[PDB]
Symmetry: C3
Subunit: 114 residues, 3 copies
């Protein structure tokens, strides 16, 4: 799995250990071993949500499987919870795009996962 967070909150507002927390929480939520979990946080971005420049985040979670109706609602609660608590971003100013990747379309270490 791969989780990316793009946000206009300042780098200084990102708690030390945030990447580790995301990794551990996602490993638990997806059931995938932490060694296959990648996380990426991009602060200080020039963005607007609903025409407002208040804290917001545009995210994405890619995974080979483990993506679905009920699972995505659960991930959303988990992820919005972490963004609200750690980055002080209101859940209603967060978009998370979920992608169920085909194993043949995910490259890793000189091959794909197919």
């Amino acid at each position: 799995p791969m989780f990316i967070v793009n946000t206009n909150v300042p780098r200084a507002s990102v708690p030390d250990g945030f990447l580790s927390e995301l990794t551990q929480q996602l490993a638990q939520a997806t059931g995938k071993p932490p060694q296959y979990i990648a996380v990426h946080v991009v602060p200080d971005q020039l963005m607007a949500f609903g025409g407002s420049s208040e804290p917001c985040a545009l995210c994405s979670l890619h995974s080979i499987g483990k993506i679905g109706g009920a699972q995505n609602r659960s991930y959303s609660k988990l992820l919005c919870g972490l963004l609200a608590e750690r980055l002080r971003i209101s859940p209603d100013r967060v978009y998370i795009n979920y992608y169920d990747m085909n194993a043949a379309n995910v490259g890793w270490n000189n091959s794909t996962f197919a």
Copy 2:
């Protein structure tokens, strides 16, 4: 809907009000309320188009519906037009990837749509 524009144009070249205009123009184009439009501009990027370092842009427009043959042509005319007039980027040095997101695959406000 969410629109992201990555470009090598410097930050100082992005005119004041650019995100507001994108928000307003996309709300009109997609027919969605401005409140749900998210815009993200990333300048000063290390990128090339056709092996040239001249002004260029790589963009993406994600939306739950409102994505299609004729609509995408219209969005492209509108967006390349804005990038040319506001950022001085030639339309033929712009790529815009369109994504028709399934509601179940979009997280927001602790849940997902649909």
Copy 3:
């Protein structure tokens, strides 16, 4: 085709000719003229792979066609090779998401390719 690389490797460690090298190699790999190739490298990123902050890369390759099981396995070798040599990134710390784009969903020059 469009190739994006997000990495925690410092900007100073990205060779000046890397975008051009990628452009040329990808043109050959995809059988498309170099002018059709766009490349984007984003260094100094805050990321973790497998819970580790050692050099890593999260990438994407979008193309209208030229994407598939065998081709993707080949692209992974080409790209891991370039990232390993030019950016000193271990190949098992590289993820590449491949996207086969419909021509109708790719905007360029005020229109789309459909």
